[PDB]
């Protein structure tokens, strides 16, 4: 699995440009992937969605009508074209695959993004924005959700997220208590319909970074401020 | 020939080997299996129509 | 000489015979005669899974009473979400006549097999997001007809080889070779303790394997046509066994007699599916005459007679939690029974 | 005159039953995937098409001449029995699709069958209705003046359909004899495909002249007790609709 | 419904429309399976445990399915042949030894139950040894089979353009063996269609398209109740 981007650069306000990604890994039919910005220094910020075969597009409330996203199967490539920008974007656009089936694993891998420096919904809050830890010891990032997240099939479509400094963030707990692959069992995570926790055991190395949490009821699709985690 | 002297002895020793094998009385195996089908006939959503509430294909 | 060597079994076998009628004291049916009626069952066909193209084969539920997998002829596999009516995976296969299909009790693997000798093993979740052969198995001289996974490396096939074979997946080799059936092996059954396994042939016979050492325990037979499909117990003492003859037959490990025969007079169809239900006294059988019927396992009756199916069954399952009843018919179709 | 209307009558009217037999039979027995195919779709569509017509024929019988209903029971009655003549084509273009040539049978091609049995229609009326509209009504009768400019509209693509069903029969009965070489094979032949075929509709141009004193009381006992026939030859005889009614039968009975 | 569900609602509906493409191909293609014995000639019609053959007369597609490593019991997996247009039976009928075991290779594929309603593409593959058999002195069908007094003498015949008059009224016997069999049982649900033919042939592929084309005409005229 591989996905590498390019578009990123400079612009002026106004510039229509556009984005693609090279997904040259794995199968780019069966996988509906997105787009999630992030600030230089700030949280991040969902932009779109496309499903496969092209069928459902989805959009934020400020990039609604003004990223058309495109979609190339065969050739491996997904696109995100930009009409006239604002200073408002000025964020990373990564790139995330994302599934959906029974048992799925929604935004399993990242790529590495591209900057572009330009020149109602279910508000989540993360509170202690800055927590202090130490190697061996266990913490407990929180995060809440203005709204009840148990709809009625019986999940609660929380996810967790994780990234380390200078690199893309990480799937760590999906659906509030499934651990993704490849990340270790002392990773775990629950709560009720409002409260959320997620306790990481036995803490390691190369676990200091920015810890996040995110909605997959509903569309909107929100995030929190980030929980970082440092020594 | 050689091969069906081995394939008779390979049978006679499985026919042996089951043979000597102890068994036990056809009334406590009924008993049993009764006793298994009567403390779980509880928890199967077929003998007893659940109500629509805990059942997930209504 | 030979023939001399040979007619020990006669012997072997009327002494066999012999302990076991004197192990027989009492039949079930006298024994659960005062036990209480099982109520009128009516089982209603709550969903219906159309999208096979072929006549479906083989059917199998996954360890969580939500995902089910089909196999037919026009070589797809096809993965269901019973609950929703949705499907999950449609895996074209190589070959286009697979009779067998197997779901591991992890959700990881799904495993078919057909004409093609071949037991072709799948990646249900991998890197590439795309399901994917693990590697085929071959080593078998015959068509498969039952494949029953033991764990996420072992699995343990029946083919028309007169043989059942055990499987190392990394290995790619058959770790055990079961040997002593005398015909077109044609369904197996593993035990809740994963230690066991029964299988039935065309010889009118049912063998119980241990799989860890290989070797046959004992052999079951009182059929008179062949054994089409075979379950055990919920609890793991017993397995019923379905025939082309119109009788189900249900037999103890621990005593290894005929407890009882599930056949009614106005039946002369063949039996292409067995399962139970989770209490031991429901005997599900699938049958010939386009009709699913359900028998009281405890008192050798009628109990169910649920239908709807054009075409013959041949595939039919109880989820693990008991929830529902699956039934796969030539028809092309799968029906949830509850 | 008089018994020319009496045949006419209870022609028309056991055949309205007849057809809701037909039509009820063949909704009922839609879940045995026997009866789910295009054969059962064109035999379905003509059965309504021609009930409904009938029904139209009987109960606008008695109507009064002028009276504005009338006027458009007839407008009306020219789609419903256009549209019954076009699905006798789709019988036929069926018909020709599998037995003359054999392959691609299977192939979907409801769009183009729909299109033709319901809607085709539409293109003769809008364009007979962007026209005329005066010879809809009647001096007599409340049909479409069968003395006008314009019963070429029923007697014009109708008379082709005919035609064509003609060729296609003989094309089918010519099979039938070989792969029967029994002539009483080729009989049922013609007697089978006489009411979806519209083959007894041929005997109409023939009564517009000539004796039509023995030959127009026989266009009315085979051609109004349509009804009968296609009820009685693709929904009480037909193998796979007797099958299918067994098992659902059996089905009921058993559940 | 929830955001995951309706995009797992979506998935499926991709692999409905999948598998209708398949279906278009599934129903325009017609399985055979290719039935006979050791020594009777599937390698030169031809030219694991299954071998597909794929090959295409005019515009319509076929599918044959001959048998490899499956032992010597056709039961149990011969019921998975039920929707297949025809059966290819090839038959050497040069050996003059194993035809009685044809015969009842023939009789058992004809009076099975669950092909009672698929007919049997006979070729009796090879008419050279034949005739460079009945030429000679050698083998002559009268010694295996004590039934040749009458001959079997074409009562209705199509030679080709020179034959033997021996080789023309031994090989119609082989034919009529074949055919009272065939026509003893079925009631008209399905009938063969005996073809002469050698080992190599181009003309072999189209005695396949015209009796699939007869069996599928014969297969629609009974849905009319007009056969
Ligand atoms: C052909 C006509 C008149 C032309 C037309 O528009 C269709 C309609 C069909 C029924 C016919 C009618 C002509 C008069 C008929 C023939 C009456 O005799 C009884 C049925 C009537």
């Known amino acids: 699995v591989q996905l590498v981007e390019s578009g990123g650069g400079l612009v002026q306000p106004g510039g229509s440009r556009k984005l693609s990604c090279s997904a040259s890994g794995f199968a780019f039919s069966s996988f509906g992937m997105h787009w999630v910005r992030q600030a230089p220094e700030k949280g991040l910020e969902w932009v779109a969605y496309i499903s496969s075969g092209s069928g459902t597009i989805y959009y934020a409330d400020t990039v609604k009508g003004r990223?058309?996203?495109?979609?190339?199967?065969?050739?491996?490539?997904?696109?995100?074209?930009?009409?006239?920008?604002?200073?408002?974007?000025?964020?990373?656009?990564?790139?995330?695959?994302?599934?959906?089936?029974?048992?799925?694993?929604?935004?399993?891998?990242?790529?590495?993004?591209?900057?572009?420096?330009?020149?109602?919904?279910?508000?989540?809050?993360?509170?202690?924005?800055?927590?202090?830890?130490?190697?061996?010891?266990?913490?407990?990032?929180?995060?809440?959700?203005?709204?009840?997240?148990?709809?009625?099939?019986?999940?609660?479509?929380?996810?967790?997220?994780?990234?380390?400094?200078?690199?893309?963030?990480?799937?760590?707990?999906?659906?509030?208590?499934?651990?993704?692959?490849?990340?270790?069992?002392?990773?775990?995570?629950?709560?009720?319909?409002?409260?959320?926790?997620?306790?990481?055991?036995?803490?390691?190395?190369?676990?200091?970074?920015?810890?996040?949490?995110?909605?997959?009821?509903?569309?909107?699709?929100?995030?929190?401020?980030?929980?970082?985690?440092?020594? | 020939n050689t091969a069906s002297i081995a394939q008779a002895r390979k049978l006679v020793e499985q026919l042996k080997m089951e043979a000597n094998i102890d068994r036990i009385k056809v009334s406590k195996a009924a008993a049993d299996l009764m006793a298994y089908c009567e403390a779980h006939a509880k928890e199967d959503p077929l003998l007893t129509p659940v109500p629509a509430s805990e059942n997930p294909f209504r | 000489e030979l023939d001399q060597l040979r007619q020990e079994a006669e012997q072997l076998k009327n002494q066999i015979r012999d302990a076991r009628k004197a192990c027989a004291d009492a039949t079930l049916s006298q024994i659960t005669n005062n036990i209480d009626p099982v109520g009128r069952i009516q089982m209603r066909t709550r969903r219906t899974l159309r999208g096979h193209l072929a006549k479906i084969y083989a059917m199998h539920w996954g360890t969580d009473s939500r995902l089910l997998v089909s196999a037919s002829q026009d070589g797809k596999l096809i993965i269901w979400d019973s609950y929703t009516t949705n499907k999950v995976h449609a895996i074209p296969l190589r070959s286009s006549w697979v009779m067998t299909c197997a779901y591991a009790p992890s959700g990881n693997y799904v495993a078919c097999g057909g004409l093609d000798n071949i037991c072709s093993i799948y990646n249900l979740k991998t890197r590439e997001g795309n399901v994917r052969v693990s590697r085929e198995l071959a080593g078998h001289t015959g068509y498969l007809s039952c494949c029953r996974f033991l764990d996420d490396n072992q699995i343990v096939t029946s083919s028309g080889?007169?043989?059942?074979?055990?499987?190392?997946?990394?290995?790619?080799?058959?770790?055990?070779?079961?040997?002593?059936?005398?015909?077109?092996?044609?369904?197996?059954?593993?035990?809740?303790?994963?230690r066991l396994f029964v299988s039935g042939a065309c010889d009118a016979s049912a063998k119980l394997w241990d799989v860890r050492e290989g070797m046959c325990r004992q052999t079951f037979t009182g059929h008179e046509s062949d054994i089409n499909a075979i379950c055990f117990f919920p609890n793991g003492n017993a397995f019923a066994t379905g025939s082309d003859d119109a009788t189900c037959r249900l037999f103890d490990l621990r005593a290894?007699?005929?407890?009882?025969?599930?056949?009614?007079?106005?039946?002369?169809?063949?039996?292409?599916?067995?399962?139970?239900?989770?209490?031991?006294?429901?005997?599900?059988?699938?049958?010939?005459?386009?009709?699913?019927?359900?028998?009281?396992?405890?008192?050798?009756?009628?109990?169910?007679?649920?239908?709807?199916?054009?075409?013959?069954?041949?595939?039919?399952?109880?989820?693990?939690?008991?929830?529902?009843?699956?039934?796969?018919?030539?028809?092309?179709?799968?029906?949830?029974?509850? | 005159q008089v018994a020319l209307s009496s045949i006419s009558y209870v022609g028309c009217s056991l055949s309205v039953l007849c057809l809701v037999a037909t039509l009820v039979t063949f909704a009922v027995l839609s879940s045995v995937s026997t009866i789910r195919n295009q054969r059962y779709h064109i035999h379905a569509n003509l059965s309504f098409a021609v009930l409904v017509a009938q029904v139209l024929?009987?109960?606008?019988?008695?109507?009064?001449?002028?009276?504005?209903?009338?006027?458009?029971?007839?407008?009306?009655?020219?789609?419903?029995?256009?549209?019954?003549?076009?699905?006798?084509?789709?019988?036929?273009?069926?018909?020709?699709?599998?037995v003359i040539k054999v392959f691609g049978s299977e192939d979907s091609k409801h769009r183009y069958y729909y299109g033709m049995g319901w809607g085709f229609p539409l293109l003769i009326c809008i364009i007979s209705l962007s026209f005329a509209m005066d010879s809809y009504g009647t001096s007599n009768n409340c049909w479409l003046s069968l003395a006008s400019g314009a019963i070429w509209a029923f007697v014009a693509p109708a008379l082709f359909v005919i035609v064509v069903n003609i060729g296609i029969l003989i094309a089918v009965t010519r099979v039938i004899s070989q792969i029967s070489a029994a002539f009483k094979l080729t009989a049922k032949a013609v007697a089978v495909l006489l009411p979806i075929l519209g083959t007894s509709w041929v005997f109409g141009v023939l009564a517009v002249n000539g004796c039509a004193v023995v030959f127009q009381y026989m266009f009315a006992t085979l051609n109004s007790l349509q009804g009968l026939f296609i009820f009685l030859f693709?929904?009480?005889?037909?193998?796979?609709?007797?099958?299918?009614?067994?098992?659902?039968?059996?089905?009921?009975?058993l559940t | 419904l929830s955001a995951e569900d309706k995009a797992a609602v979506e998935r499926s509906k991709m692999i409905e429309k999948q598998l209708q493409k398949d279906k278009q191909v599934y129903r325009a293609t017609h399985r055979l399976l290719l039935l006979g014995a050791d020594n009777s000639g599937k390698s030169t019609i031809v030219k694991s445990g299954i071998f597909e053959t794929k090959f295409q007369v005019d515009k319509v597609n076929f599918h044959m399915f001959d048998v490899g490593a499956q032992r010597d019991e056709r039961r149990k997996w011969i019921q998975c042949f039920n929707d297949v247009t025809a059966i290819?039976?090839?038959?050497?009928?040069?050996?003059?030894?194993?035809?009685?075991?044809?015969?009842?290779?023939?009789?058992?594929?004809?009076?099975?139950?669950?092909?009672?309603?698929?007919?049997?593409?006979?070729?009796?593959?090879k008419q050279d040894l034949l005739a460079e058999k009945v030429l000679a002195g050698k083998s002559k069908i009268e010694d295996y089979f004590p039934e040749f007094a009458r001959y079997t003498t074409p009562?209705?015949?199509?030679?080709?353009?020179?034959?033997?008059?021996?080789?023309?009224?031994?090989?119609?016997?082989?034919?009529?063996?074949?055919?009272?069999?065939?026509?003893?049982?079925?009631?008209?649900?399905?009938?063969?269609?005996?073809?002469?033919?050698?080992?190599?042939?181009?003309?072999?592929?189209?005695?396949?398209?015209?009796?699939?084309?007869?069996?599928?005409?014969?297969?629609?005229?009974?849905?009319?109740?007009?056969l």
């Open chain 4, 57 to 98: 024929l009987l109960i606008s019988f008695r109507l009064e001449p002028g009276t504005t209903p009338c006027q458009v029971m007839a407008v009306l009655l020219h789609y419903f029995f256009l549209s019954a003549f076009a699905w006798m084509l789709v019988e036929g273009l069926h018909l020709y699709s599998m």
């Open chain 3, 161 to 194: 080889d007169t043989t059942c074979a055990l499987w190392d997946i990394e290995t790619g080799q058959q770790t055990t070779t079961f040997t002593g059936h005398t015909g077109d092996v044609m369904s197996l059954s593993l035990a809740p303790d994963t």
């Open chain 5, 155 to 226: 009562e209705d015949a199509t030679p080709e353009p020179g034959e033997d008059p021996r080789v023309t009224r031994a090989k119609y016997f082989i034919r009529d063996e074949f055919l009272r069999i065939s026509t003893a049982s079925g009631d008209g649900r399905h009938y063969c269609y005996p073809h002469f033919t050698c080992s190599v042939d181009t003309e072999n592929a189209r005695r396949i398209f015209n009796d699939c084309r007869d069996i599928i005409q014969r297969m629609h005229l009974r849905q009319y109740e007009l």
């Open chain 1, 67 to 231: 990223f058309t996203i495109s979609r190339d199967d065969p050739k491996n490539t997904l696109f995100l074209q930009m009409t006239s920008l604002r200073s408002e974007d000025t964020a990373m656009y990564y790139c995330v695959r994302s599934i959906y089936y029974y048992g799925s694993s929604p935004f399993d891998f990242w790529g590495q993004g591209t900057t572009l420096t330009v020149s109602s919904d279910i508000v989540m809050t993360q509170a202690t924005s800055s927590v202090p830890v130490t190697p061996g010891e266990s913490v407990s990032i929180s995060c809440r959700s203005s709204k009840s997240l148990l709809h009625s099939n019986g999940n609660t479509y929380l996810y967790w997220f994780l990234q380390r400094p200078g690199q893309s963030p990480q799937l760590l707990i999906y659906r509030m208590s499934n651990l993704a692959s490849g990340v270790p069992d002392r990773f775990s995570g629950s709560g009720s319909g409002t409260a959320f926790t997620l306790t990481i055991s036995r803490l390691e190395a190369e676990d200091v970074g920015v810890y996040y949490c995110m909605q997959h009821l509903e569309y909107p699709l929100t995030f929190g401020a980030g929980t970082k985690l440092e020594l």
């Open chain 5, 88 to 125: 290819i039976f090839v038959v050497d009928s040069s050996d003059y030894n194993r035809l009685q075991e044809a015969l009842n290779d023939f009789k058992s594929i004809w009076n099975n139950r669950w092909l009672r309603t698929i007919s049997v593409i006979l070729f009796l593959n």
């Open chain 3, 256 to 338: 290894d007699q005929e407890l009882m025969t599930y056949s009614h007079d106005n039946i002369i169809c063949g039996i292409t599916s067995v399962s139970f239900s989770k209490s031991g006294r429901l005997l599900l059988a699938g049958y010939d005459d386009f009709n699913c019927n359900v028998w009281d396992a405890l008192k050798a009756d009628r109990a169910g007679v649920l239908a709807g199916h054009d075409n013959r069954v041949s595939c039919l399952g109880v989820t693990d939690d008991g929830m529902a009843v699956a039934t796969g018919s030539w028809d092309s179709f799968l029906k949830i029974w509850n």
């Open chain 4, 234 to 253: 693709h929904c009480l005889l037909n193998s796979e609709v007797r099958a299918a009614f067994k098992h659902k039968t059996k089905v009921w009975s």
